[PDB]
Amino acid sequence: DRCRYTLCCDGALKAVSACLHESESCLVPGDCCRGKSRLTLCSYGEGGNGFQCPTGYRQC
């Protein structure tokens, strides 16, 4: 079948849609929850291959 346009982050640009396959992965974004306000940005979390949230925010 044809690639499955997924939404990944470039790490330095802006989360967009890329033509990647299921056997392929990319820097997936993260939705930071703040009380009652959700937000989606690109940010990694010190460790290896995980996403984190900014100070004052949380994981959605």
Side-chain angles (χ1 to χ4, degrees):
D1 333 72
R2 333 99 207 204
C3 91
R4 238 166 286 193
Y5 277 85
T6 322
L7 280 127
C8 299
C9 277
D10 168 29
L13 237 92
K14 230 67 83 101
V16 85
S17 327
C19 175
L20 132 157
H21 319 294
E22 226 87 54
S23 245
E24 204 223 298
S25 50
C26 26
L27 206 298
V28 173
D31 288 49
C32 290
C33 265
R34 195 171 253 207
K36 326 199 211 150
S37 271
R38 61 108 48 84
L39 195 49
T40 298
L41 327 149
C42 324
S43 279
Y44 322 156
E46 29 262 321
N49 296 326
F51 171 101
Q52 226 236 7
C53 272
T55 301
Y57 278 94
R58 209 238 224 163
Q59 261 121 247
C60 271

